[PDB]
Design a protein around this ligand. Structure first.
Ligand SMILES: Nc1ccn([C@H]2C[C@H](O)[C@@H](COP(=O)(O)OP(=O)(O)OP(=O)(O)O)O2)c(=O)n1
Ligand SMILES: Nc1ccn([C@H]2C[C@H](O)[C@@H](COP(=O)(O)OP(=O)(O)OP(=O)(O)O)O2)c(=O)n1
Ligand code: NA
Ligand code: NA
Ligand code: NA
Ligand code: NA
Ligand code: NA
Ligand code: NA
Ligand code: NA
Ligand code: NA
Lengths: 375, 375
DNA sequence: AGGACCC
DNA sequence: GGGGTCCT
DNA sequence: AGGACCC
DNA sequence: GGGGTCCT
């Protein structure tokens, strides 16, 4: 009757798990993936040693200091295994929303309902859960809603088995009645495990968070904005005057995060499909030097156009983005001339981006190109 | 081989022509439609007396000063006859782009081609033009392109006959090979006439303009921006250094208006379909007075919601817009809560718009509401 | 959210 | 004036 | 064009 | 870090 069953799939240590598949010799050698001076992520064969995501190399390294590092500044292989996952999930139900390269929501409502359509009266008593149940809560085989959530978790365990048999990947699921809760209950047991949340334990999940910043939807800026007003817990946010919430953020944000704080989230799962933009990015110590920076720009374009091509679609807008020292980024944008779309192409393309460059740079700590408006 | 046939349909004195249909007694009584202190438009039974569009009432009136005026601040009847026109044109070819309440582009390419598909070798010599030919230019019955443009104008004359037999409306057409030129050649003979432009007279059309501001695409601001640099004629704009054009407007605008200045326009005719927004607007002497201005806002909402309803679709964003004395307008915007979409509705709606109001008004010459993001 | 354009 | 469209 | 969010 | 999404 309008209650949903959503699954939130979230792969373990994604990048490190691609590097290990490519290079067995890194199988339980404690592994971190390197981008610039950061350990962007590391394997659980390494996490125990107090090595954390986005930890300094020097820090990550003093700990360990044989832990092993691979460069992961080129995201090609990760983007490619990432879409294989969504594609796999799409085979179950077509409505798959990506969050990042490693998270997916699937709306399982239509599938739970078909399955249960499909059972005799007896085989209805023997419906079992698969994996964890949040807060060790008792199942009631007569609660139409518990019955679905368990069938949910049966699907999830199938999605997980398949991600492993078909892509050699392990990870987590959370089943629950909306995206917020599903995203939250997928982390309870890590790393290669899954959890289902029964409606009666919703407040327990929600109140188990220590910081409002842990709510998907509330950011760094938002949080410190609430902290300023004296709102630190989920309950502070629950009990707090709508009128005061409006006087800081707008009725847009104010009414939405308050729902979030109660565990209430109506957003549907959206079909991501193909991406709305391809971009490429380079970051540095400084730069400033028109001509190489034309280089740096040349580099991004060569790689970008390869990617954009295969897709099949074509993009009708280019973007240039920069950063100074000293964020705090600045962008210029323009359409991509008709005849230029047909495809030669780099030559005329660089001219573009380079005027675009001059419109904000006279007399730089990052450069990046984006193609968007894909048709 | 990739050359198009576009028709640009543009109704005479649109509003005044709706008022005359509703009220015969205004048939050749020299008629102007009034909005506030302006004559927004007047009939040709009145234009000869040097009465012009957007002329003061006092001015429009000293001239004439029995000319007759009707209020046209409520655009309901005009919007309704307007869509009947597009709908009529849609019956010919489905791809109709609106410009305003009174202009339409139809791409006739597929239809000219079918018709000519459809003629015997003889009946190909007897293909005649219908209406004017721009610059009295000779037709060459062996130029595949003249042949189409004439078939174009045969369609246009049918569209016009039909607008008159079916809606009692008269107006103009221009046929030509792109939107820019079609829009330009439709005005050559006014008011109830049509013109076709053969490719050989394109420069004659283009150079017959006196100000660049007369090019559809070049505005008030743009123009005075070029005037500043010493570019006043179409040819000044033609011959003028791409590099200098970029240093004022961007490679976006710079490369596009230069094409325009040569008569070159690749933009396809786009299917407008249903509108992307409904708005309502009120303008005044001053205001300032929270409570009535809640009135003024109440008014717009009552009318807006009526309109929005019938459509069938529903809007997921509301907008509030204001203006000060003293443009120079200021807007706030927010989504329209899920449960509120279902539809009661004014009550919760006003609260919205009124906070939105306070976010820019402390301690006003126009107020208006917009619903957009229609799904 | 503002801003360029078009009627 | 009283509306619209797209782009940034 | 910038800005909030997410990985 | 190196990417993404939507909204204003
Ligand atoms: N700010 C961020 C956040 C994440 N990632 C990357 C690194 C991870 O490999 C990956 C996917 O996101 P997760 O947050 O799920 O991080 P992990 O998958 O690495 O870890 P885990 O499941 O162990 O928590 O994308 C990144 O580069 N920069
Ligand atoms: N700034 C403007 C421009 C136009 N209109 C209105 C008045 C006209 O009735 C109509 C349609 O546009 P046109 O520019 O074609 O103007 P007309 O149809 O009035 O006149 P005409 O064909 O005689 O030139 O919309 C308006 O209200 N405000
Ligand atoms: Na399957
Ligand atoms: Na968060
Ligand atoms: Na989220
Ligand atoms: Na017809
Ligand atoms: Na113009
Ligand atoms: Na135009
Ligand atoms: Na468009
Ligand atoms: Na969306």
């Amino acid at each position: 009757a309008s209650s949903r069953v959503i699954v939130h799939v979230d792969l373990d240590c994604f990048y490190a798990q691609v590097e290990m598949i490519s290079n067995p010799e890194l199988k339980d050698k404690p592994l971190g993936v390197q981008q610039k001076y950061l350990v962007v992520t590391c394997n659980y064969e390494a996490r125990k040693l107090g090595v954390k995501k986005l930890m300094n190399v020097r820090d990550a390294k003093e700990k360990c200091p044989q832990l092993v590092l691979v460069n992961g500044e080129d995201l090609t292989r990760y983007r490619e295994m990432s879409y294989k996952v969504t594609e796999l999930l799409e085979e179950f139900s077509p409505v798959v929303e990506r969050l990042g390269f490693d998270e997916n929501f699937v709306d399982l409502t239509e599938m739970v309902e078909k399955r249960l359509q499909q059972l005799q009266s007896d085989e209805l008593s023997a419906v079992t859960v698969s994996g964890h149940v949040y807060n060790n809560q008792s199942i009631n085989l007569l609660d139409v809603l518990h019955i679905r959530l368990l069938v949910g978790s049966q699907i999830a365990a199938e999605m997980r088995e398949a991600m492993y048999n078909q892509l050699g990947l392990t990870g987590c699921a959370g089943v629950a009645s909306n995206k917020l809760l599903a995203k939250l209950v997928s982390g309870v047991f890590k790393p290669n495990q899954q959890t289902v949340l029964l409606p009666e334990s919703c407040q327990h999940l929600i109140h188990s968070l220590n910081h409002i910043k842990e709510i998907p939807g509330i950011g760094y800026k938002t949080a410190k904005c609430l902290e300023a007003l004296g709102i630190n817990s989920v309950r502070d946010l629950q009990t707090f005057s709508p009128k005061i919430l409006e006087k800081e953020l707008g009725i847009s944000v104010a009414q939405r995060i308050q729902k979030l704080s109660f565990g209430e989230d109506n957003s549907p799962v959206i079909l991501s499909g193909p991406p709305q933009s391809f971009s490429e990015e380079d970051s540095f110590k400084k730069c400033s030097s028109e001509v190489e920076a034309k280089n740096k720009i040349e580099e991004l374009l060569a790689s970008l156009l390869n990617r954009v091509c295969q897709d099949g679609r074509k993009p009708h807008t280019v973007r240039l983005i920069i950063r100074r020292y000293s964020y705090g980024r600045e962008s210029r944008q323009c359409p991509i001339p008709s005849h230029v779309i047909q495809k030669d192409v780099m030559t005329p393309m660089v001219d573009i981006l380079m005027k675009l460059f001059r419109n904000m740079v006279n007399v730089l700590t990052l450069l990046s190109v984006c193609f968007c408006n894909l048709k």
